[PDB]
Design an enzyme around this catalytic site. Structure first.
Site, mmCIF file in Angstrom:
data_model
loop_
_atom_site.group_PDB
_atom_site.id
_atom_site.type_symbol
_atom_site.label_atom_id
_atom_site.label_comp_id
_atom_site.label_asym_id
_atom_site.label_seq_id
_atom_site.Cartn_x
_atom_site.Cartn_y
_atom_site.Cartn_z
ATOM 1 N N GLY A 1 1.499 6.826 8.823
ATOM 2 C CA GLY A 1 2.884 7.346 8.822
ATOM 3 C C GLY A 1 3.816 6.189 9.203
ATOM 4 O O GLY A 1 4.955 6.240 8.766
ATOM 5 N N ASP B 1 -0.149 -7.474 1.837
ATOM 6 C CA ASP B 1 0.393 -6.081 1.820
ATOM 7 C C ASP B 1 1.927 -6.114 2.082
ATOM 8 O O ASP B 1 2.370 -5.805 3.200
ATOM 9 C CB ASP B 1 -0.421 -5.221 2.793
ATOM 10 C CG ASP B 1 -0.100 -3.721 2.661
ATOM 11 O OD1 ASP B 1 0.458 -3.260 1.680
ATOM 12 O OD2 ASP B 1 -0.542 -2.984 3.589
ATOM 13 N N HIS C 1 0.845 -1.241 0.000
ATOM 14 C CA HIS C 1 0.000 0.000 0.000
ATOM 15 C C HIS C 1 0.868 1.274 0.000
ATOM 16 O O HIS C 1 0.307 2.374 -0.278
ATOM 17 C CB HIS C 1 -1.117 0.021 1.056
ATOM 18 C CG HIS C 1 -0.813 0.459 2.444
ATOM 19 N ND1 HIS C 1 -0.524 -0.415 3.470
ATOM 20 C CD2 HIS C 1 -0.631 1.689 2.979
ATOM 21 C CE1 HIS C 1 -0.216 0.252 4.576
ATOM 22 N NE2 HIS C 1 -0.283 1.520 4.295
ATOM 23 N N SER D 1 3.164 3.059 8.385
ATOM 24 C CA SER D 1 2.949 2.031 7.326
ATOM 25 C C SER D 1 4.194 1.582 6.625
ATOM 26 O O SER D 1 5.019 2.371 6.144
ATOM 27 C CB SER D 1 1.894 2.497 6.318
ATOM 28 O OG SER D 1 0.589 2.636 6.885
ATOM 29 N N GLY D 2 4.343 0.282 6.486
ATOM 30 C CA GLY D 2 5.488 -0.346 5.801
ATOM 31 C C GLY D 2 6.654 -0.683 6.729
ATOM 32 O O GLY D 2 7.570 -1.383 6.309
HETATM 33 C C1 LIG Z 1 -12.818 -3.788 2.475
HETATM 34 C C2 LIG Z 1 -11.765 -4.373 3.338
HETATM 35 N N1 LIG Z 1 -11.748 -5.735 3.316
HETATM 36 N N2 LIG Z 1 -10.873 -3.650 4.101
HETATM 37 C C3 LIG Z 1 -9.854 -4.290 4.919
HETATM 38 C C4 LIG Z 1 -8.916 -3.351 5.684
HETATM 39 C C5 LIG Z 1 -8.401 -2.155 4.876
HETATM 40 O O1 LIG Z 1 -8.108 -1.034 5.802
HETATM 41 C C6 LIG Z 1 -7.549 0.112 5.252
HETATM 42 C C7 LIG Z 1 -7.370 0.073 3.830
HETATM 43 C C8 LIG Z 1 -6.799 1.161 3.156
HETATM 44 C C9 LIG Z 1 -6.442 2.265 3.948
HETATM 45 C C10 LIG Z 1 -5.867 3.445 3.523
HETATM 46 C C11 LIG Z 1 -5.506 3.844 2.223
HETATM 47 C C12 LIG Z 1 -4.941 5.125 2.080
HETATM 48 C C13 LIG Z 1 -4.749 5.937 3.226
HETATM 49 C C14 LIG Z 1 -5.117 5.503 4.520
HETATM 50 C C15 LIG Z 1 -5.698 4.220 4.667
HETATM 51 N N3 LIG Z 1 -6.156 3.542 5.774
HETATM 52 C C16 LIG Z 1 -6.076 4.061 7.151
HETATM 53 C C17 LIG Z 1 -4.906 3.439 7.883
HETATM 54 C C18 LIG Z 1 -3.707 3.133 7.203
HETATM 55 C C19 LIG Z 1 -2.618 2.554 7.862
HETATM 56 C C20 LIG Z 1 -2.717 2.224 9.241
HETATM 57 C C21 LIG Z 1 -1.626 1.619 9.890
HETATM 58 C C22 LIG Z 1 -1.762 1.313 11.264
HETATM 59 C C23 LIG Z 1 -2.961 1.589 12.007
HETATM 60 C C24 LIG Z 1 -3.038 1.232 13.380
HETATM 61 N N4 LIG Z 1 -4.036 1.474 14.218
HETATM 62 N N5 LIG Z 1 -1.997 0.629 13.967
HETATM 63 C C25 LIG Z 1 -4.035 2.189 11.322
HETATM 64 C C26 LIG Z 1 -3.917 2.519 9.944
HETATM 65 C C27 LIG Z 1 -5.006 3.139 9.274
HETATM 66 C C28 LIG Z 1 -6.610 2.343 5.346
HETATM 67 C C29 LIG Z 1 -7.180 1.221 6.008
HETATM 68 C C30 LIG Z 1 -9.416 -1.717 3.785
HETATM 69 C C31 LIG Z 1 -10.865 -2.199 4.164
HETATM 70 K K LIG Z 2 -0.316 4.982 5.954
#
Ligand SMILES: CC(=N)N1CCC(Oc2ccc3c4ccccc4n(Cc4ccc5ccc(C(=N)N)cc5c4)c3c2)CC1
Ligand SMILES: [K+]
Ligand SMILES: [Ca+2]
Ligand SMILES: [Ca+2]
Length: 223
Positions: A175, A84, A40, A177-178
């Site tokens: 922030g 991911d 991602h 992420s990865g």
């Molecule tokens: C439909 C389905 N099966 N899903 C499964 C889970 C998935 O959850 C997602 C999917 C895509 C995104 C996304 C994309 C761009 C920017 C921020 C995005 N976020 C919010 C996001 C992104 C990274 C995180 C890392 C740690 C944490 C954490 N609490 N430790 C929360 C996060 C939240 C997402 C959360 C998508 C929904």
């Molecule tokens: K992120």
């Protein structure tokens, strides 16, 4: 990282910052030429920054190396975040030192309750936004699969694990992420997603690295 501590300059030597004119994701150095991060986090124009403490000050230990190649997992699903994981090859080999070191791939998966170290330059606020300049660290245990799946019904795959606290207050966040999840000196996870950050009953979800070892080893050997 929410509810973490300041790690200290180069305390997590395998921690990498992915930059595309700004920091946008973390990563882990697995060898002199390869970095592991989340699919991602995929983007064009990636510069890898090693040996970083404060991302907004050059304190002299940094190595900024362009990516020559990016490889997102063949089965990455952007909708669900299953698989991911992405590999990033460096243009030139990084110079390993006390500050820049690689982390080993796991030989086996880790058990629920195993303590881990998560790190990154992500948001430090449960609800609010405040990005740190220095790397934050957090110790968190791997949660049982039941706890994980109860928390996110129909969304957890065998390629994911939960780590954190059900009582909330401490987690990874946007922030981070990865970024690496290191348990017993092996890279067990990659910061992938969650529901908000540090919320009660909504732990962090991580890509389960131990499922990807032959893919990583084979991919690297052929690129
Ligand atoms: C439909 C389905 N099966 N899903 C499964 C889970 C998935 O959850 C997602 C999917 C895509 C995104 C996304 C994309 C761009 C920017 C921020 C995005 N976020 C919010 C996001 C992104 C990274 C995180 C890392 C740690 C944490 C954490 N609490 N430790 C929360 C996060 C939240 C997402 C959360 C998508 C929904
Ligand atoms: K992120
Ligand atoms: Ca510093
Ligand atoms: Ca710096």
């Amino acid at each position: 990282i929410v509810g973490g501590y300041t790690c200290g300059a180069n305390t997590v030597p395998y921690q990498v910052s992915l930059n595309s004119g700004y920091h946008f994701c973390g990563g882990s150095l697995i060898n002199s030429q390869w970095v592991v991060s989340a699919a991602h986090c995929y983007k064009s124009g990636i510069q890898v920054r090693l040996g970083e403490d404060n991302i907004n000050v050059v304190e002299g230990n940094e190595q900024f190396i362009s990516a020559s190649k990016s490889i997102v997992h063949p089965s990455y699903n952007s909708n669900t975040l299953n698989n991911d994981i992405m590999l990033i090859k460096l243009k030139s080999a990084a110079s390993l030192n006390s500050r820049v070191a690689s982390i080993s791939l796991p030989t086996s998966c880790a058990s629920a309750g195993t303590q881990c170290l998560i790190s990154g330059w992500g948001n430090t606020k449960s609800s609010g936004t405040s990005y740190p300049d220095v790397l934050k660290c957090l110790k968190a245990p791997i949660l049982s699969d039941s706890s994980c799946k109860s928390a996110y019904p129909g969304q957890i795959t065998s390629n994911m694990f939960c780590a954190g606290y059900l009582e909330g207050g401490k987690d990874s966040c946007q922030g981070d992420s990865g970024g690496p999840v290191v348990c017993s000196g092996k890279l067990q996870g990659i910061v992938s997603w969650g529901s908000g950050c540090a919320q009660k009953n909504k732990p962090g979800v991580y890509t389960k690295v131990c499922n990807y070892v032959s893919w990583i080893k084979q991919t690297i050997a052929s690129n």
